[PDB]
Each structure stands twice: as C-alpha cells, then as structure tokens.
Design an enzyme around this catalytic site. Structure first.
Site, mmCIF file in Angstrom:
data_model
loop_
_atom_site.group_PDB
_atom_site.id
_atom_site.type_symbol
_atom_site.label_atom_id
_atom_site.label_comp_id
_atom_site.label_asym_id
_atom_site.label_seq_id
_atom_site.Cartn_x
_atom_site.Cartn_y
_atom_site.Cartn_z
ATOM 1 N N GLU A 45 0.790 -1.226 0.000
ATOM 2 C CA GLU A 45 0.000 0.000 0.000
ATOM 3 C C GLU A 45 0.823 1.277 0.000
ATOM 4 O OE1 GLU A 45 -3.126 0.019 -0.413
ATOM 5 O OE2 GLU A 45 -3.832 -1.974 0.171
ATOM 6 N N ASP A 69 -6.475 6.182 -4.575
ATOM 7 C CA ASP A 69 -5.981 4.812 -4.642
ATOM 8 C C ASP A 69 -6.102 4.293 -6.075
ATOM 9 O OD1 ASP A 69 -8.666 3.936 -5.051
ATOM 10 O OD2 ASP A 69 -8.856 2.960 -3.123
#
Ligand SMILES: CC1(C)CC(N)CC(C)(C)N1[O-]
Ligand SMILES: CC1(C)CC(N)CC(C)(C)N1[O-]
Length: 164
Positions: free
Chosen positions: A11, A20
């Site tokens: 991440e 994202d």
C-alpha cells in the site's frame, strides 16, 4: 516478514490525501476514506477517523495508528464471515496474511465472493487455487499485487516479498 510489513509494501505510505488504484480518496497506508468523488467528504471522513480537524495531512504516527486499526478490522471481518472464517482457520500463518491482504484491499464481502477459490484454498490445492484466483477482476486490475498475494498462497512462503 509479517502482515504489517506485507501491507506496508503493497500500500505504501502517504501522509496527504491521495487517490488509490480505483480512484478513491485514501490516506496513510491504504486507508480508504470514501468512494465519494467529493474531496470535502473525504476530508470530513479523515477528521472523524483521526479525531481532530486536519488539513488533509496526518503524521506518520497517525497513519500507523489507522493502519493497525485497519489490519484488526480485516481480521474481524474474516472471523465474522461464515465463508471466510473456516478458510482462515485452515491456513498456516503465512497464508493467513495473504487472506488478510485481500480483505484489506477489497473488503470482507468482496473476498467472500471468491467462493470457488476459497474452497480450493481450504482443500490445500494450492496451484489450482492460484489459477482460479487469477481469473478475477482483482488480478486484472492490480496484477503485480495479486501475483505477490497469489504466490504467497501458492507457496506458503514470503518469496514474493523477499527482494522488496
Ligand atoms: C516497511 C517495509 C519497507 C515495507 C516493505 N513492503 C516490506 C518490509 C520488509 C517490511 N519493509 O521493511
Ligand atoms: C491445474 C493448474 C496447476 C492450475 C494453474 N493455475 C493453471 C494450469 C496450467 C491449468 N495448471 O497447471
């Protein structure tokens, strides 16, 4: 290696609101704020999550606090789900991390939808499970991450993360 390390790699770490891989406002170590296209809505979610009025920027300690909450929430989602819990219980600790990784990325409901993959994992048919997991929107949209997670399921090792 452990699940915190694994997800920190997959991440990244960003201290300001960003989008994202699906275009959704996020902060920290992959902490999804909202699917709303409103940056103001995302900033309100951040303030509520952190407990203070932010400017859209948090500290590293605050990012790690959200991250630990989110890893815990992923495990809770697995254990409260009738399809995910028996699979999780059947897995070794390395492969448990792979399942937590999937739930962190896609949520409990999404991963519980992998019905046939879950059955193959519980049967410990690792190569068959690996192929079936790749026949997914998940693999097609984030192939390098999905390949790392699938390699972890296939081998029960951290080999996909060793050089990272
Ligand atoms: C924190 C960081 C840089 C993230 C990587 N994804 C994996 C490990 C090995 C844990 N390390 O050290
Ligand atoms: C049965 C098995 C091991 C699953 C793989 N994911 C794909 C093919 C090539 C069909 N093989 O070999």
């Amino acid at each position: 290696m452990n699940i915190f390390e694994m997800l920190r790699y997959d991440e990244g770490l960003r201290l300001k609101i960003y989008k994202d891989t699906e275009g959704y406002y996020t902060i920290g170590i992959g902490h999804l704020l909202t699917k709303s296209p409103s940056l103001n809505a995302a900033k309100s979610e951040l303030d509520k999550a952190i407990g203070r009025n932010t400017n859209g920027v948090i500290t590293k300690d605050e990012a790690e606090k959200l991250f630990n909450q989110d890893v815990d929430a992923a495990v809770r989602g697995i254990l409260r789900n009738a399809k995910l819990k028996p699979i999780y219980d059947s897995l070794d600790a390395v492969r448990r991390a792979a399942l937590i990784n999937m739930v962190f990325q896609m949520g409990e409901t999404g991963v519980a939808g992998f019905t046939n993959s879950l059955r193959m994992l519980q049967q410990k048919r690792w190569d068959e499970a690996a192929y079936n997991l790749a026949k997914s929107r998940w693999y097609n949209q984030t192939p390098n991450r999905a390949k790392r997670v699938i390699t972890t399921f296939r081998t029960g090792t951290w080999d996909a993360y060793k050089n990272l």
